[PDB]
Every structure is written in structure tokens, then in C-alpha cells.
Amino acid sequence: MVGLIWAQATSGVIGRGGDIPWRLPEDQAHFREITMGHTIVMGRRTWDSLPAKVRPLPGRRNVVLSRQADFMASGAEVVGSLEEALTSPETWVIGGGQVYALALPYATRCEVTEVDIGLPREAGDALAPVLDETWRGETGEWRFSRSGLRYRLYSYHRS
Amino acid sequence: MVGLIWAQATSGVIGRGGDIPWRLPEDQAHFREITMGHTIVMGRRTWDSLPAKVRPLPGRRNVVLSRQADFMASGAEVVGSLEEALTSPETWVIGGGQVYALALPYATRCEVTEVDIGLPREAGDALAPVLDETWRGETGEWRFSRSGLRYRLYSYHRS
Ligand SMILES: NC(=O)C1=CN([C@@H]2O[C@H](COP(=O)(O)OP(=O)(O)OC[C@H]3O[C@@H](n4cnc5c(N)ncnc54)[C@H](OP(=O)(O)O)[C@@H]3O)[C@@H](O)[C@H]2O)C=CC1
Ligand SMILES: NC(=O)C1=CN([C@@H]2O[C@H](COP(=O)(O)OP(=O)(O)OC[C@H]3O[C@@H](n4cnc5c(N)ncnc54)[C@H](OP(=O)(O)O)[C@@H]3O)[C@@H](O)[C@H]2O)C=CC1
Ligand SMILES: Nc1nc(N)c(/C=C/C2CC2)c(-c2ccc(C(F)(F)F)cc2)n1
Ligand SMILES: [Co+2]
Numbered sequence: 001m002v003g004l005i006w007a008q009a010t011s012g013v014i015g016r017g018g019d020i021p022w023r024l025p026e027d028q029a030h031f032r033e034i035t036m037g038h039t040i041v042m043g044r045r046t047w048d049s050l051p052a053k054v055r056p057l058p059g060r061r062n063v064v065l066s067r068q069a070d071f072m073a074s075g076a077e078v079v080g081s082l083e084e085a086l087t088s089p090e091t092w093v094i095g096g097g098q099v100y101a102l103a104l105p106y107a108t109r110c111e112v113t114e115v116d117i118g119l120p121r122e123a124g125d126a127l128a129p130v131l132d133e134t135w136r137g138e139t140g141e142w143r144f145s146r147s148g149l150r151y152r153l154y155s156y157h158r159s
Numbered sequence: 160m161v162g163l164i165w166a167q168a169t170s171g172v173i174g175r176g177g178d179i180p181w182r183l184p185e186d187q188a189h190f191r192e193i194t195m196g197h198t199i200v201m202g203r204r205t206w207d208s209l210p211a212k213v214r215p216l217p218g219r220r221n222v223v224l225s226r227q228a229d230f231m232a233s234g235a236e237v238v239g240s241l242e243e244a245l246t247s248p249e250t251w252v253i254g255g256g257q258v259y260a261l262a263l264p265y266a267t268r269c270e271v272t273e274v275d276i277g278l279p280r281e282a283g284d285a286l287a288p289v290l291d292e293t294w295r296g297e298t299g300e301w302r303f304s305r306s307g308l309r310y311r312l313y314s315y316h317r318s
């Protein structure tokens with residue numbers, strides 16, 4: 001099982017300026033629940049976005065994709081291809097835009113948090129992947145984050 | 160990864176008289192999508208409940224759990240303990256009531272369809288397992304089947 005997990009604005013923006021223009025504790029808790037115990041695969045830029053204090057994310061096999069053969073990610077594995085990272089029963093691809101696109105052919109689940117923020121797309125933004133017809137999606141109810149933004153979860157799935 | 164998948168009335172009834180006392184085509188398509196490609200494990204009574212013309216379920220490794228040492232299920236593997244049945248990247252336990260109770264301590268996910276049908280629990284009924292607070296899951300909310308019944312999906316997980 002390869003899954004993708006991401007949060008996006010309604011416009012599809014998932015990152016900007018190397019970070020994320022919102023922060024929902026409730027979604028972070030859902031992210032921890034879904035990924036705990038499993039492999040997490042992330043691009044190098046997303047690894048760079050994690051403060052050294054918090055990485056590797058605990059209780060998970062942290063894997064970083066990089067084309068730099070000598071890149072060092074203390075507490076993680078750095079691999080040069082996505083296929084190397086797929087040696088567990090569950091692998092969660094946790095970003096960013098480039099790695100979601102690369103991992104989509106391998107995936108059977110996308111856990112997508114939609115953030116009710118009106119965020120027009122900018123040059124340089126990282127964007128969520130386009131999901132074609134093969135994906136089956138249950139659209140959850142709008143929830144109120146304590147941050148003030150509404151959000152809802154889509155659990156997309158395909159065989 | 161061991162998951163349980165079932166559809167229940169709100170009361171918890173999943174089976175009666177060797178049958179499922181409703182029809183929900185959207186749930187069947189959902190069950191097909193989640194189980195396709197994977198191992199499916201079922202108790203002998205559930206295997207018996209499938210007409211020979213529609214078993215084994217296509218595209219899945221069908222496994223039947225029975226205490227009869229040399230029971231034959233043409234088109235499936237027969238095992239005498241759930242543990243022999245599991246061997247998986249991904250196994251879905253597909254019923255019925257006895258096998259769900261046996262399998263729950265090994266499960267990390269339950270995919271539950273709840274059918275809004277006023278079905279009282281009756282002596283002899285097959286019942287769904289009742290899930291702890293340790294099973295964290297969203298809560299679907301009510302959808303309308305072309306069968307005319309109302310239904311919703313729960314995706315339970317525990318870390
Ligand atoms: N909203 C959300 O849910 C999430 C948002 N984000 C955001 O996403 C943004 C970063 O995403 P993005 O900019 O797309 O960068 P990524 O995080 O996708 O990392 C891109 C890097 O991954 C490596 N890489 C990419 N493709 C390959 C390949 N085929 N083979 C080997 N290595 C590869 C390269 O590393 P190198 O350059 O070292 O070779 C590349 O520079 C940030 O803003 C971040 O905050 C991230 C995760 C979740
Ligand atoms: N709504 C739904 O999602 C579903 C509903 N159903 C319904 O459920 C009902 C059947 O459920 P149920 O009556 O509980 O029967 P099960 O389908 O759970 O089969 C029970 C049988 O499995 C075998 N078995 C049970 N425990 C063990 C064990 N520990 N070791 C080895 N073998 C074991 C025995 O077979 P033997 O007697 O051969 O030893 C036992 O008779 C039917 O009405 C069916 O339609 C079924 C699946 C899904
Ligand atoms: N959600 C959920 N879980 C399940 N384990 C099952 C079925 C298990 C098995 C093998 C008999 C279903 C399901 C599928 C098809 C039908 C219908 F063919 F009768 F229409 C009814 C119910 N649905
Ligand atoms: Co699957």
C-alpha cells in the first residue's frame with residue numbers, strides 16, 4: 001500500500017515559499033494518526049522545511065528522496081529513487097509537490113485535507129496532484145479548526 | 160496490514176438466515192474497490208452463502224476459515240486458523256460475525272458501512288464487532304442509495 005497525504009487550499013496550493021500558509025492542529029493530529037508506525041517518504045525540500053528539533057518524525061521510518069548522492073538527513077534514509085523507499089506494508093508519501101506527482105502511479109489512497117482558504121495560485125507554489133477518473137472519493141463534512149479556518153477530509157481510494 | 164470490512168444496520172446486525180437482509184449497490188462497489196487485488200478471508204458460513212456461480216470472488220486470493228480439517232472450497236484456500244490465513248501485504252477480513260470477532264485483535268483498520276434501516280437485533284443474528292474508543296474514525300453522514308436506503312461510511316484506524 002502506497003498512500004499520499006496532503007492538505008491543500010481550495011485552489012490546490014499545498015506550499016509556498018518553502019513552507020505552508022496555514023497551520024491546523026487538528027489536521028496535524030490526523031496526519032500523525034495516519035502515518036504513525038509506517039514509512040513516510042518526503043522530498044528533500046520538505047525535509048528541509050522540518051525544524052531539526054522535530055525530525056525525524058518519531059515512530060516512523062523517515063525516508064528522504066534526493067538526487068544528491070551525498071545529501072545527509074540525520075535520522076533518516078536518503079534514497080535516490082522512490083522505489084527504494086517502498087519496502088514496508090504501508091508507505092505514506094507526505095510531500096511535497098514533486099514527490100506527490102512522482103508517487104501517484106504507485107498510490108491507492110490519497111488522504112486529502114481541503115482548507116477553506118481562498119489562496120490564488122502564485123508562481124513558485126507547490127500544488128496538489130491532479131486525480132483522474134480512477135480515484136473514488138468520499139467528501140467529508142466541513143469542520144471548524146480552532147485556527148478559524150474550515151477544513152474537510154477527502155479519503156480518495158482506488159484498487 | 161489486516162483490515163476488517165463489513166456493512167451493518169445501525170443495530171449491528173450484519174446477517175440473518177445465511178443472508179444479508181438488504182441490498183446496497185454503492186456498498187458493493189465500495190467493497191469491491193477496497194478488496195480487489197488482495198487476500199480476502201471469510202468464515203465457512205460466509206463461503207456457503209455465496210452461490211457457486213459467484214465464488215471465488217474475482218481478482219482476490221479467496222481464503223476460507225474452517226475447523227473441518229479437510230473441508231474443500233473449490234476456488235479458495237482452506238485454513239484452520241486465522242493466522243494461517245493472514246499472509247499478506249494486505250488482507251481484508253470480509254465476514255462473517257464469528258470471523259470478525261476472531262480477527263479484530265489483529266486488525267489495524269475497519270471499513271464500516273452503516274445502513275439506516277430499522278433492523279432489530281434478533282436471536283441468532285450475526286453481529287458486527289463493537290469498536291473501542293481506541294478505534295478513531297471520521298463519521299460519514301448520510302448518503303442516499305439508488306436502493307432507496309440511506310447509508311454512510313466509517314473509516315476506522317488504530318496506531
Ligand atoms: N500542504 C502539505 O500537505 C504539504 C506541503 N508541503 C510543501 O511543499 C513544498 C515543497 O514541495 P516541492 O517544492 O515540490 O519539493 P519536494 O518536497 O517535492 O522535494 C523536491 C526534491 O525532492 C528530490 N526529488 C524530486 N524528484 C526526484 C526524483 N525523481 N528522484 C530523486 N530525487 C527527487 C529533489 O531533491 P534534491 O534537490 O535534493 O535532488 C527535489 O529538489 C514546501 O512549501 C512544503 O512546505 C510539503 C509537504 C506537505
Ligand atoms: N453484512 C456483511 O458485511 C456481511 C454479512 N455476512 C453474513 O454473516 C452471516 C455469517 O456470519 P457467521 O454466522 O458469523 O459465520 P462466519 O461466516 O463467521 O463462519 C463461521 C465459521 O467459520 C469457521 N470458524 C469460526 N471461528 C473459527 C476459528 N477460530 N478457527 C477456525 N475456523 C473457525 C467455522 O467453520 P466450520 O463450521 O466449517 O468449522 C464456523 O462455523 C451470514 O448471514 C452472512 O450473510 C457475511 C459477510 C459480510
Ligand atoms: N461493506 C461490505 N462488507 C462486506 N464484507 C461485504 C460482503 C461480504 C461477503 C462475501 C459475502 C459487503 C457486501 C458485498 C456484496 C453484497 C451483495 F452482493 F449481496 F450485494 C452485500 C454485501 N459489504
Ligand atoms: Co487495495
Ligand SMILES: [Co+2]
Nearest residue numbers: 034036317318
Ligand atoms: Co496505520
